[PDB]
C-alpha cells in the first residue's frame, strides 16, 4: 500500500534542534497535500506545518519563524526542521497526506507518529549558595541521561516561589532552609517525597525530621546552618567573649579607623540570635542593646549583608556574623580569619535560628522523577555535595559519609557549637508571617520610629 514511516524523534534542550523526517512507500508527486500535526498528552490534534503540490508552505502562529516544511520528491520524504526548541512544542508528531484518486474523492493517510521531548531542568537556590557548584553536579547529569540543568537564583525567591509555582510553572526543584517548607507543604506547592530506605540510610535521622509535616516528607535534607562569630585575628587575636564588652573594644577600633562587629541588620535571621539570648523580658533586653549600638553609633543604620561582607574582607570590621556559605569569599580576599561561639548576652549564650537547607519537587512540576534522580544520585552523594561545598561551603551536610571531614574543620566545629546553643526552626505556615512581624519590628527600632516595648506588642498580635 502507501504507508508513512516518521522518524527523528528524541529529547533535546530548550533552544536545540530537531529534524523529524517522514518517508512515505509511494511517489509524493501523487499527493496533493503533506503536512505534520501534534499531540501533547491530553489535548486536541494542532497542526504546526504543511506543503502542497504547489510548493505553497503555511505554519501555525506558534511554530512560525522558528519550524521549517521542507520535501524531498526524489527520497520521497517530508521534513520538519524544528529549530529552536521550547517546553510548550513537546508532543508526539505525526506525519500527515492527503491523495485526490483519480475521481472526485479524496484519501487522508497518517503515520506511526514520533515522540518529541523538550525538557529542562530548572533549580531555583539563593545567591549567597553554590549555585557554581550546583551547576558542575548538573553538568554532570547532562552527560549521563541528556536533561540540561540551569541552575538560577532569583532575589525574593522565598517569597516569590509561592506566587510564580502556584500560578505559572516556576522552577522543578527548589532551595532554601526547611522553615519555609511548611507553608509551600500547607498550600499544596510541594510533592511529597518518597526516597527508598536505602537512600534514606545515607542521611542521619535527626536531618529528615526537620523536612517533614503532617507525618510526610516534603523536602530532602543537604546540610545544617548556623550562624558564628567570623572575626578578623589580625585586628583582634583574642576576640569578645560577651557582647556587652563590644562597645569598648569599638571605642578602642574606632580610634584606628576600623569598626568592631558589622552584620546584615535588615535580616532578622542575623539579629534573631542577641534577642533570643536570654528570651518577653528577653526579647526587650536583646532588642535595646543592639538599639543602643546604632545609637552609640558603633553600628550603621542600614547595615546588609553586601556592606557587611565588604567592610569584613576589605579588613574594615574586626568582626561580622554570617553562615557556611560566606567563608569562601573571605578566603578569596587576604584575611586570616576565625569563626567563633557567637557572643554571650546577659551571660547566656545569644541563640542563632538552625536551619536545614532542603531540596523540595514543585507539585506543579512534569520532571518530578527526573528531579528525583538528581537529588538522590547526582547531588545527595559525597561527590555531589563535595562539588557545591568547594564552590561555597554548606554546613554540617546531612551526608553521614561526610562526619570525618566535617570533624576535620575547624570551622564547622564553631558552626555546630552555636547550632547546640541555638534551635531549629518549627517548618510551621505561621513561619512567613513571624519572620514578617520580626523584619519590620527590628528595622523600625533601628532606624528610629517605633520603641523597643512597641515593637514586640506589634509584633506579638
Ligand atoms: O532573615 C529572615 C530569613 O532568615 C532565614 O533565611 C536565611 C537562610 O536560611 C540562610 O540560608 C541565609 O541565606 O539567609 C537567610 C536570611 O538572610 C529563614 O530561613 C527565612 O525564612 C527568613 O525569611
Given at each position: 500500500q502507501r504507508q508513512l514511516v516518521e522518524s527523528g524523534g528524541g529529547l533535546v534542550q530548550p533552544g536545540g534542534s530537531l529534524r523529524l523526517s517522514c518517508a512515505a512507500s509511494g511517489?509524493?508527486?501523487?499527493?496533493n497535500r503533506m503536512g505534520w500535526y501534534r499531540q501533547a498528552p491530553g489535548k486536541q490534534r494542532e497542526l504546526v506545518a504543511a506543503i502542497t503540490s504547489g510548493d505553497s508552505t503555511n505554519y501555525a502562529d506558534p511554530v512560525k519563524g522558528r519550524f521549517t516544511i521542507s520535501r524531498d520528491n526524489a527520497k520521497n520524504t517530508v521534513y520538519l526542521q524544528m529549530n529552536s526548541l521550547k517546553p510548550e512544542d513537546t508532543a508526539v508528531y505525526y506525519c500527515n497526506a492527503k491523495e485526490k484518486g483519480w475521481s472526485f474523492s479524496l484519501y487522508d493517510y497518517w503515520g506511526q507518529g514520533t515522540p518529541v521531548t523538550v525538557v529542562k531542568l530548572v533549580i531555583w537556590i539563593n545567591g549567597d549558595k553554590g549555585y557554581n557548584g550546583l551547576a558542575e553536579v548538573g553538568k554532570?547529569?547532562?552527560?549521563?541521561?541528556?536533561?540540561?540543568?540551569?541552575?538560577?537564583?532569583?532575589?525574593?525567591?522565598?517569597?516569590?516561589?509561592p506566587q510564580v509555582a502556584a500560578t505559572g510553572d516556576g522552577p522543578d526543584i527548589i532551595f532554601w532552609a526547611h522553615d519555609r517548607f511548611g507553608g509551600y507543604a500547607q498550600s499544596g506547592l510541594l510533592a511529597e517525597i518518597t526516597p527508598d530506605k536505602a537512600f534514606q540510610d545515607k542521611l542521619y535521622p535527626f536531618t529528615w525530621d526537620a523536612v517533614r509535616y503532617n507525618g510526610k516528607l516534603i523536602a530532602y535534607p543537604i546540610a545544617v546552618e548556623a550562624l558564628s562569630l567570623i572575626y578578623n585575628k589580625d585586628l583582634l587575636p583574642n576576640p569578645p567573649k560577651t557582647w556587652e564588652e563590644i562597645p569598648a573594644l569599638d571605642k578602642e577600633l574606632k580610634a584606628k579607623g576600623k569598626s568592631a562587629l558589622m552584620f546584615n541588620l535588615q535580616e532578622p535571621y542575623f539579629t534573631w540570635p542577641l534577642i533570643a539570648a536570654d528570651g518577653?523580658?528577653?526579647?526587650?533586653?536583646?532588642?535595646?542593646?543592639?538599639?543602643?549600638?546604632?545609637?552609640?553609633?558603633?553600628?550603621?543604620?542600614?547595615?546588609?549583608?553586601?556592606?557587611?561582607?565588604?567592610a569584613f574582607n576589605k579588613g574594615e570590621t574586626a568582626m561580622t556574623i554570617n553562615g557556611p556559605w560566606a567563608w569562601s569569599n573571605i578566603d578569596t580576599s587576604k584575611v586570616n580569619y576565625g569563626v567563633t561561639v557567637l557572643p554571650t548576652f546577659k551571660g547566656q549564650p545569644s541563640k542563632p535560628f538552625v536551619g536545614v537547607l532542603s531540596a523540595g519537587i514543585n507539585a506543579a512540576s512534569p520532571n518530578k522523577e527526573l528531579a528525583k534522580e538528581f537529588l538522590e544520585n547526582y547531588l545527595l552523594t559525597d561527590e555531589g555535595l563535595e562539588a557545591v561545598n568547594k564552590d561555597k561551603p554548606l554546613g554540617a551536610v546531612a551526608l553521614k559519609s561526610y562526619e570525618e571531614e566535617l570533624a576535620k574543620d575547624p570551622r564547622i566545629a564553631a558552626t555546630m557549637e552555636n547550632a547546640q546553643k541555638g534551635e531549629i526552626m518549627p517548618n510551621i505556615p505561621q513561619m512567613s508571617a513571624f519572620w514578617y512581624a520580626v523584619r519590620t519590628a527590628v528595622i523600625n527600632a533601628a532606624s528610629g520610629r517605633q520603641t523597643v516595648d512597641e515593637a514586640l506588642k506589634d509584633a506579638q498580635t
Amino acid at each position: 500500500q502507501r504507508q508513512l514511516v516518521e522518524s527523528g524523534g528524541g529529547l533535546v534542550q530548550p533552544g536545540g534542534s530537531l529534524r523529524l523526517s517522514c518517508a512515505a512507500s509511494g511517489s509524493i508527486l501523487y499527493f496533493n497535500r503533506m503536512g505534520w500535526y501534534r499531540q501533547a498528552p491530553g489535548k486536541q490534534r494542532e497542526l504546526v506545518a504543511a506543503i502542497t503540490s504547489g510548493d505553497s508552505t503555511n505554519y501555525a502562529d506558534p511554530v512560525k519563524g522558528r519550524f521549517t516544511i521542507s520535501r524531498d520528491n526524489a527520497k520521497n520524504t517530508v521534513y520538519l526542521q524544528m529549530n529552536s526548541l521550547k517546553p510548550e512544542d513537546t508532543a508526539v508528531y505525526y506525519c500527515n497526506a492527503k491523495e485526490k484518486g483519480w475521481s472526485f474523492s479524496l484519501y487522508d493517510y497518517w503515520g506511526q507518529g514520533t515522540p518529541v521531548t523538550v525538557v529542562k531542568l530548572v533549580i531555583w537556590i539563593n545567591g549567597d549558595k553554590g549555585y557554581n557548584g550546583l551547576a558542575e553536579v548538573g553538568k554532570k547529569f547532562e552527560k549521563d541521561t541528556g536533561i540540561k540543568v540551569t541552575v538560577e537564583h532569583p532575589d525574593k525567591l522565598e517569597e516569590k516561589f509561592p506566587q510564580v509555582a502556584a500560578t505559572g510553572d516556576g522552577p522543578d526543584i527548589i532551595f532554601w532552609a526547611h522553615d519555609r517548607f511548611g507553608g509551600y507543604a500547607q498550600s499544596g506547592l510541594l510533592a511529597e517525597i518518597t526516597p527508598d530506605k536505602a537512600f534514606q540510610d545515607k542521611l542521619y535521622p535527626f536531618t529528615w525530621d526537620a523536612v517533614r509535616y503532617n507525618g510526610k516528607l516534603i523536602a530532602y535534607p543537604i546540610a545544617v546552618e548556623a550562624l558564628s562569630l567570623i572575626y578578623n585575628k589580625d585586628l583582634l587575636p583574642n576576640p569578645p567573649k560577651t557582647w556587652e564588652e563590644i562597645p569598648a573594644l569599638d571605642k578602642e577600633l574606632k580610634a584606628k579607623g576600623k569598626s568592631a562587629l558589622m552584620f546584615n541588620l535588615q535580616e532578622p535571621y542575623f539579629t534573631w540570635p542577641l534577642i533570643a539570648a536570654d528570651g518577653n523580658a528577653g526579647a526587650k533586653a536583646g532588642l535595646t542593646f543592639l538599639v543602643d549600638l546604632i545609637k552609640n553609633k558603633h553600628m550603621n543604620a542600614d547595615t546588609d549583608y553586601s556592606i557587611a561582607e565588604a567592610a569584613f574582607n576589605k579588613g574594615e570590621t574586626a568582626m561580622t556574623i554570617n553562615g557556611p556559605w560566606a567563608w569562601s569569599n573571605i578566603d578569596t580576599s587576604k584575611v586570616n580569619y576565625g569563626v567563633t561561639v557567637l557572643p554571650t548576652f546577659k551571660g547566656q549564650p545569644s541563640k542563632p535560628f538552625v536551619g536545614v537547607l532542603s531540596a523540595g519537587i514543585n507539585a506543579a512540576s512534569p520532571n518530578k522523577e527526573l528531579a528525583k534522580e538528581f537529588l538522590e544520585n547526582y547531588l545527595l552523594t559525597d561527590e555531589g555535595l563535595e562539588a557545591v561545598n568547594k564552590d561555597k561551603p554548606l554546613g554540617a551536610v546531612a551526608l553521614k559519609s561526610y562526619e570525618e571531614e566535617l570533624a576535620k574543620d575547624p570551622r564547622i566545629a564553631a558552626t555546630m557549637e552555636n547550632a547546640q546553643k541555638g534551635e531549629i526552626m518549627p517548618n510551621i505556615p505561621q513561619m512567613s508571617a513571624f519572620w514578617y512581624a520580626v523584619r519590620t519590628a527590628v528595622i523600625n527600632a533601628a532606624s528610629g520610629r517605633q520603641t523597643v516595648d512597641e515593637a514586640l506588642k506589634d509584633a506579638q498580635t
